[PDB]
């Protein structure tokens, strides 16, 4: 019979009505000292977590996602996230933390494989500012959900969305976040988001390198010791390093940072990895760093890089074949004088 997503409608209607409640408060918020009363709408008193929790679970299925997209679900969930962040700031309140996490999980699912929803969410600038700001939250699980959203927003982004992600300071915020995270799984999401952002433009690459301690940290991630039986951190960190190494190659200071954290020698060890992503990333980084610098050319020569790169030039993987060969040409074309006697 009349069997539609009316429960979903009811759950969206709950969230829109709570959103409405909140915007009445902040419309009425007399700048600064609103009054002695001090009561914002509390999301617990509206039972919002259960509502957003249900929409989050429904968002794993594609058919419910289609229904959600017809009924403006992404706009409502994003609005919910924004307003709570704006009202209560960077709280450790578990009810507020849980709310933002579940909202962010739904936005992650809703932006997955959906270029329109990526653009819509990116066009909601206030929500995007809230997301970025939540990377400074003391909840590392919130950070992790926030980075998951930005990871999907940074993948197959249209040019305006790419422009917005840059303008809201997502790149700097993710890199500064990364330096302070303890939980491995949080770091994965954070570095997954950065790896994506790092391929967009020179400006994003430059901003990653400009963050204090960021290149030293990224070199450290190359020898990360996982507690989750995965190479995600080495792959993502090295992938970020590969994309930004085009700029590091022009910069003697940034090269010197890499040298003192044993980067080139680690990149050579990475050529023997059982992850082909790690080998590929290293071949890309070595390609860049072996151009236009005698110091690192001579250093790679001394570490046996030429013999190591030879072994991969006939690889069946294309970027390993291309990456090792181009780095090999550079070293062959700049043979140090002491290897001609």
């Amino acid at each position: 019979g009349h069997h539609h997503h009316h429960h979903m409608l009811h759950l969206l209607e709950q969230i829109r009505a709570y959103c409405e409640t909140c915007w009445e408060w902040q419309e009425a918020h007399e700048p600064g000292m609103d009054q002695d009363k001090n009561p914002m709408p509390a999301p617990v008193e509206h039972q919002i977590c259960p509502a957003v929790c249900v929409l989050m679970k429904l968002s794993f299925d594609e058919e419910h996602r289609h229904a959600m997209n017809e009924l403006g679900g992404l706009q409502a969930i994003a609005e919910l996230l924004q307003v709570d962040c704006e009202m209560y700031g960077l709280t450790n309140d578990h009810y507020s933390i849980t709310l933002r996490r579940y909202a962010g999980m739904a936005l992650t699912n809703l932006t997955f494989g959906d270029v329109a929803n990526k653009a819509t969410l990116c066009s909601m600038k206030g929500c995007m500012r809230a997301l970025v700001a939540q990377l400074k939250s003391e909840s590392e699980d919130l950070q992790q959900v926030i980075a998951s959203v930005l990871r999907n927003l940074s993948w197959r982004a249209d040019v305006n969305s790419k422009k917005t992600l840059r303008e809201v300071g997502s790149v700097k915020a993710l890199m500064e976040c990364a330096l302070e995270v303890k939980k491995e799984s949080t770091l994965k999401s954070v570095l997954s988001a950065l790896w994506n952002l790092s391929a967009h433009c020179t400006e994003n690459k430059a901003d990653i390198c400009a963050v204090d301690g960021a290149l030293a940290f990224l070199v450290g991630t190359l020898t990360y010791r996982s507690q989750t039986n995965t190479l995600a951190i080495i792959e993502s960190g090295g992938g970020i390093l590969r994309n930004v190494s085009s700029l590091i190659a022009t910069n003697e200071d940034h090269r010197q940072i890499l040298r003192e954290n044993n980067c080139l020698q680690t990149l050579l060890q990475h050529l023997k990895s059982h992850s082909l992503t790690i080998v590929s990333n290293a071949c890309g980084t070595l390609w860049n760093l072996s151009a236009r610098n005698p110091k690192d050319q001579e250093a790679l020569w001394d570490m046996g890089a030429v013999s190591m790169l030879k072994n991969l030039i006939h690889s069946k993987h294309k970027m390993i074949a291309m990456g090792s060969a181009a780095a090999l040409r550079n070293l062959m074309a700049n043979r140090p004088a002491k290897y001609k006697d």
């Binding site: 999980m105 992650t108 990871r151 993948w155």
Partner: peptide, 7 residues
């Protein structure tokens, strides 16, 4: 890093 459902 690609894209993904939440995990």
């Amino acid at each position: 890093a690609g894209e993904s459902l939440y995990e």
